[PDB]
Paper text:
Uropathogenic Escherichia coli strains use filamentous type 1 pili to adhere to and invade uroepithelial cells. The pilus consists of a flexible tip fibrillum, formed by the adhesin FimH and the subunits FimG and FimF. The pilus rod is a helical assembly of up to 3000 copies of the main subunit FimA, terminated by a single copy of the subunit FimI that anchors the rod to the assembly platform FimD in the outer membrane. The assembly platform FimD in the outer membrane of uropathogenic E. coli is the catalyst of type 1 pilus assembly.
To explore the structural implications of FimI-mediated termination of pilus assembly, we performed a FimD-catalyzed assembly reaction of pilus rods in vitro similar to the one for the FimDHGFAnC complex, except that excess FimICHis was also added at the end of the reaction. Since a ten-fold excess of FimICHis over FimD was used to ensure saturation with FimI, we also observed non-physiological states in 3D classification, such as complexes lacking pilus rods due to premature FimI incorporation after FimF, or complexes containing two terminal FimI subunits (FimDHGFAnI2CHis complex, maps XVII and XVIII). Given the low FimI concentrations in the periplasm (FimA:FimI ratio ≥100:1), we focused our analysis on physiological pilus complexes with a single terminal FimI subunit capped by FimCHis.
Author numbering:
A (entry chain I): 8 to 41, 52 to 89, 100 to 117, 129 to 140, 149 to 160
B (entry chain C): 1 to 94, 101 to 205
C (entry chain D): 121 to 153, 157 to 187, 197 to 304, 310 to 422, 426 to 452, 476 to 611, 619 to 642, 645 to 802, ...
D (entry chain B): 24 to 160
């Protein structure tokens, strides 16, 4: 005996990629000062490739009184290539922290989703 | 760890509040989540209220932030409005450099009565080719985002054309005549490839 | 010592609460020719004390008496990952034939194991020379990808992809394939199941007697894909023993063979020995799915149900053959053929059943053509039927995101041809009407005589109510179903329950819809009951802030539960009632330090100062002061009479 | 045994599911239950029934339903139906799991979930249509 038609409704929505770091606590151990390369990796998982690729990366923080491009001696950040990454500017990323002569600092890694 | 439930938010006009899911899947970390609403140009505004503005969480846990509107129906009802929603994830700690994660997404204040369908708005975009620039003009009061902008055999940078307005992007002289583009729906999914019509 | 993906440790399972349970389902039918009234009330009582689940089913009938149908007690044994159903029940019937009974039944439960270690999935071995990463490829999909330390590695959490194809083990570098095919009788290596059963025998037929029997089936897996399954069905006058083996050949497919030998004492006091051999072959693959099943039984072989008849059904089955061929045309069309052939002993009667069909889906329209052919020598005729079904949603013509309520409506058209008798054409509109889609209209009219069927089902926060009218004979169906949960804090009403239930406790917050539910709303007291919850998994219960009252706020709107089977799991939410206010608090003409804590004195609330001293507080009265700790301060405040009317109150507070 | 007229035309809503809920193929979303009611059933003719679900099978997996093709439609996602015991039932096939009958009213429970048949999940509408047929002993 035939039964009856049945309908299933539902919608799927994309979401922000989960963002974490290889080092726990979102803390980088720069070490005591006396320059010193401290590498740390940021991971973007738990999302689709299109969403992961269509992002915008920027850095924010307190600018040093002498050098606004150096996070408040100071801490500088370099990418894989080795180019200097200025702060306050418009799946695994490795960034190297260095000590620059001009101690706790805080930085804002900002990801904008298109 | 910290993750949002949607890449974009749609707020219908007259709605009392909207919910947004924020989740964390790590059992041994404490996170302080702070939120606020920015305008199109990136200026702090009180037109929207995030509740809670700042709250702490521990372990595997998910919460819902409520977005309230105090604009008092001041935004125009003939077109959509754009806002930047920011979510800051402060890691509660107990030489060290601390990192915070700021996720920025788009919130579209959409009026009640609209002339054009949101899905049909994608294919109504028009293009103009200058000597070295491409101008995208939108005859729809809907916000439109262009992705995978191929000019011949090469791609170009993304653009955010405003409703009832025009946007300009670069265009190499050696780029091909054909123009192809993609748009994003309200669900964050890329629309099927559509040819570029010239006017 | 790696664990399966999505593993739940055996400590987060909630035993539940010592609570009662009632499920009422009253159905009445008024048939007018007539004016005959039928009532089929059903009551399912239940109790949860400790970790024991007591269930009772009783039906009250009426025509214009009570019948105790079922009664059992269940207890889950975690160390054995099994369940003991002390009382009434029935056998699984996976190996033998399912039979109702009343007695002890200790059976392994697969739901205890994680979702990854389910179905059939070959274990992946291999020694990794140096550090490397392994990827599983199937139909161009990375099934699993993770780093592996140097040395031998074992992977046993591969998802039960089903037919699919072969798994390419891309290590980073021996690139080798592993065949993969499964049948319902195939199990992963190491996985073990058992269904020990003892007690009397019961059945619906009154002629059948009530003997005492012992049924025990054991299935085990061996390396290289072997699966060995045995079973015994011992009884006073019936002895059946089954033995079988299943193997994944791979490219050839999957084959399961078993043989059962049975000695049966018929009511004629005659002993009969018989055998039954069953083959099950499954093959995948553009894609042509083939399923073949054969069951050949020698004369004199009978099931345990055949020897339970009264002291002092004649023809016996000889062979059952089943063919199932599925071919996919394109990415839209699917054609299927199914055939069942029956042979007996001492006669040429064949009970043939053939079903062919084609399903196609447009962007919105979905249409299907099916043909049925039932040949039975008992009736000396071949019934042939042709059925065409078309489903068309109204969104095809309606504009996108339309404000009209018709956007959820859909249309259905059905054509039926007997090719030798009366035809039928039925057209009907079905959809939802209420704000939360709790309504369901199914108004259809057709010609055979005119047939008009209109149902107005409704799913409220107290119970489900269905009213239907059938015109041909004027029948009227009415039905009220619901459930009553008696917990420690009181009694609540809601929709009919299904196994596990979640009692959400929101004291002071009333009329709060829950997310991803069919209009389940909290009562005036605040409690609510979810109809269903997943067993031994991580759930997600959330409250809709939009439906939340304007004077109520939730600290943690979303929670997660891990409910044991048949356990009433109570999830609480702290609801703060009062005025929501964002205070700009300043201390010594300066904003308070970031991260300082604020605790209410008049009420129980906490908050963070955050930036610019903008602290958000909920459930606060019209006056009073709080304590700010960063180093202590107090700040009294006063509110206008319209503060309650205003959704959010913004005031400038001054510290000590 | 006649089915309830209301059950012959029912719609089940799965709500909204986060895409990253599906990492790899084979994972399932939040389950949603639905019931089918059989009234005035007579056990004399038969005491056992089975359910067969015929529908459009997906192009990459013939064990789940189809969501169609077109703009604004989720891809690599299908609808999977499971019995009350949690075992997968292959659609478009004769019934495999059989249930007993009680005189009067009988209720059958089933579970619907979202199954990922692709490496990546694309958001969008994932509506589907199927039907059920009853096979008596």
């Amino acid at each position: 005996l035939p039964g009856g038609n049945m309908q299933f409704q539902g919608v799927i929505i994309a979401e922000t990629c989960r963002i974490e770091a290889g080092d726990k606590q979102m803390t980088v151990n720069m070490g005591q000062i006396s320059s010193a390369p401290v590498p740390f990796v940021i991971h973007l998982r738990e999302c689709s490739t299109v969403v992961s690729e269509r992002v915008g990366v920027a850095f924010h923080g307190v600018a040093d009184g002498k050098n606004p491009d150096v996070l408040s001696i100071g801490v500088a950040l370099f990418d894989d290539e080795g180019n200097l990454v200025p702060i306050n500017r418009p799946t695994s990323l490795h960034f190297i922290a260095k000590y620059r002569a001009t101690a706790n600092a805080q930085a804002w890694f900002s990801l904008t989703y298109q | 760890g910290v993750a949002l439930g949607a890449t974009r938010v749609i707020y219908p006009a007259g709605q009392k509040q909207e919910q947004l899911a924020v989740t964390n899947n790590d059992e041994n970390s404490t996170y302080l989540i702070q939120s606020w609403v920015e305008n199109a140009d990136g200026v702090k505004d009180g037109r929207f209220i995030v509740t809670p503005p700042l709250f702490a969480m521990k372990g595997k846990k998910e919460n819902t932030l409520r977005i309230l509107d105090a604009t008092n129906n001041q935004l125009p009802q003939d077109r959509e409005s754009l806002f930047w929603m920011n979510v800051k994830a402060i890691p509660s700690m107990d030489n060290t450099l601390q990192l915070a994660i700021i996720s920025r997404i788009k919130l579209y204040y959409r009026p009640a009565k609209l002339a054009l369908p949101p899905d049909q708005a994608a294919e109504k975009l028009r293009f103009r080719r200058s000597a070295n620039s491409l101008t995208l003009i939108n005859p729809t009061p809907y916000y439109l985002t262009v992705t995978e902008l191929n000019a011949g055999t090469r791609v170009l940078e993304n653009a955010l054309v405003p409703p009832m307005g025009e946007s300009t992007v670069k265009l190499p002289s050696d780029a091909g005549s054909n123009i192809t583009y993609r748009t994003i729906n309200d669900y964050g999914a890329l629309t099927p490839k559509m040819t570029g019509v010239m006017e | 010592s790696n664990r399966a993906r999505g593993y739940i440790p055996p400590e987060l399972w909630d035993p539940g609460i010592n609570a009662g349970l009632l499920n009422y389902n009253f159905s009445g039918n008024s048939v007018q020719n007539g004016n005959s009234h039928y009532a089929y009330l059903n009551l399912q009582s239940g109790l949860n004390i400790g970790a024991w689940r007591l269930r009772d089913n009783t039906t009250w009938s009426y025509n214009s008496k009570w019948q105790h149908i079922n009664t059992w007690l269940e207890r889950d044994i975690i160390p054995l990952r099994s369940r003991l159903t002390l009382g009434d029940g029935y056998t699984q019937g996976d190996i033998f034939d399912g039979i109702n009974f009343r007695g002890a039944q200790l059976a392994s439960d697969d739901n205890m194991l994680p979702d990854s270690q389910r179905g059939f999935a070959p274990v992946i071995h291999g020694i990794a020379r140096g550090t490397a990463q392994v990827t599983i490829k199937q139909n161009g999909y990375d099934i699993y990808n993770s780093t592996v330390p140097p040395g031998p590695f074992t992977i046993n959490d591969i998802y039960a992809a089903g037919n699919s194809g072969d798994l390419q083990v891309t290590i980073k570098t021996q690139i080798f394939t592993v065949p993969y095919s499964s049948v319902p009788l195939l199990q992963r290596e190491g996985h073990t199941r058992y269904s020990i059963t003892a007690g009397e025998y019961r059945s619906g037929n009154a002629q059948q007697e009530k003997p005492r029997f012992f049924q025990s089936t054991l299935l085990h897996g061996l390396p290289a894909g072997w699966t060995i399954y045995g079973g015994t069905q011992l009884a006073d006058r019936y002895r059946a023993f089954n033995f079988g083996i299943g193997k994944n050949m791979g490219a050839l497919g999957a084959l399961s063979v078993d043989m059962t030998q049975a000695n049966s004492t018929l009511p004629d006091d005659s002993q009969h020995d018989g055998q039954s051999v069953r083959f099950l072959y499954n093959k995948s693959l553009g894609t042509n799915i083939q399923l073949v099943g054969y069951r050949y039984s020698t004369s004199g072989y009978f099931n345990f149900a055949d020897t339970t008849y009264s002291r002092m059904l004649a023809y016996n089955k000889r062979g059952k053959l089943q063919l199932t061929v599925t071919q996919q045309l394109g990415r839209t069309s699917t054609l299927y053929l199914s055939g069942s052939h029956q042979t007996y002993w001492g006669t040429s009667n064949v009970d043939e059943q053939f079903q062919a069909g084609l399903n196609t889906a447009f962007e919105d329209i979905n249409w299907t053509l099916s043909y049925s052919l039932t040949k039975n020598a008992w009736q000396k005729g071949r019934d042939q039927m042709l059925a065409l079904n078309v489903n068309i949603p109204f969104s095809h013509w309606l504009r996108s995101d339309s404000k009209s309520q018709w956007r959820h409506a859909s249309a259905s058209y059905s054509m039926s041809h007997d090719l030798n008798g009366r035809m039928t054409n039925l057209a009907g509109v079905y959809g939802t009407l209420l704000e939360d889609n709790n309504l369901s209209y199914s108004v259809q009219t057709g010609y055979a005589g005119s047939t008009g069927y209109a149902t107005l089902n409704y799913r409220g926060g107290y119970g489900n109510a269905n009213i239907g009218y059938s015109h041909s004979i004027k029948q009227l169906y009415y039905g009220v179903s619901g459930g009553v949960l008696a917990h420690a804090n009181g009694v609540t009403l809601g929709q009919p329950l299904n196994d596990t239930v979640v009692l959400v406790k929101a004291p002071g917050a009333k009329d709060a819809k829950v997310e991803n539910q069919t209009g389940v709303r909290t009562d005036w007291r605040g409690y609510a009951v979810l109809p269903y919850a997943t067993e031994y998994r991580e759930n997600r219960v959330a409250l809709d802030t939009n439906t939340l009252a304007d004077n109520v706020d939730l600290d943690n709107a979303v929670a997660n539960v891990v409910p044991t089977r048949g356990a009433i799991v109570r999830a609480e939410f702290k609801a703060r009632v009062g005025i929501k206010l964002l205070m700009t608090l300043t201390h010594n003409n300066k904003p308070l330090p970031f991260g300082a804590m604020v605790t209410s004195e008049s009420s129980q609330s906490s908050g963070i100062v955050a930036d610019n001293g903008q602290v958000y507080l909920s459930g606060m009265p019209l006056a009073g002061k709080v304590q700010v700790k960063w180093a202590h301060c107090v700040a009294n405040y006063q509110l206008p009479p319209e503060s309650q009317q205003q959704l959010l109150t913004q005031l400038s507070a001054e510290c000590r």
